[PDB]
Amino acid sequence: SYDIQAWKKQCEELLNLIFQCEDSEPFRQPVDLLEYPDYRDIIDTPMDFATVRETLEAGNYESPMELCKDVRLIFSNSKAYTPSKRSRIYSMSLRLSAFFEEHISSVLSDYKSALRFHKRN
Numbered sequence: 001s002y003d004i005q006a007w008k009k010q011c012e013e014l015l016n017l018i019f020q021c022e023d024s025e026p027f028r029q030p031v032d033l034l035e036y037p038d039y040r041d042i043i044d045t046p047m048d049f050a051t052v053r054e055t056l057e058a059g060n061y062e063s064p065m066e067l068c069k070d071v072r073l074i075f076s077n078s079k080a081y082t083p084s085k086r087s088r089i090y091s092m093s094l095r096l097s098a099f100f101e102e103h104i105s106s107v108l109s110d111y112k113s114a115l116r117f118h119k120r121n
């Protein structure tokens with residue numbers, strides 16, 4: 001399966017599944033800086049799933065590795081803000097991360113395989 005472009009629709013479908021997860025609600029939109037005025041004191045690079053979807057649709061990701069880095073930044077940023085290992089948001093961030101990682105693994109493998117096939121000769 002050596003389609004170099006296939007990752008983009010696969011990532012759009014996975015973002016649709018993440019939007020349907022109730023566990024995504026707190027990560028869907030950019031954190032309101034007025035609601036949390038100290039957010040930018042701790043978080044250097046804000047990220048959320050609407051920003052990831054818009055970047056993808058703008059044609060501003062070259063590879064699924066770049067999309068994966070931004071999704072992993074949502075989860076690291078949530079971990080940097082949260083106050084407990086038994087925080088509600090933290091419990092949701094960890095379930096959503098496991099779901100994301102389970103599904104992105106084949107997207108990354110297939111992309112890297114397709115690029116190796118393109119370079120094979």
Ligand SMILES: COc1ccc(NC(=O)N2CCN(C(=O)c3ccoc3)C[C@@H]2C)cc1
Pocket residue numbers: 026027028029031047048049073074075077078079081082089
């Ligand atoms: C009183 O009811 C509530 C319950 C939950 C919240 N949400 C939060 O505390 N959050 C801070 C940590 N987050 C993030 O750092 C992040 C957001 C996108 O990517 C990461 C998630 C989210 C915005 C606010 C009020």
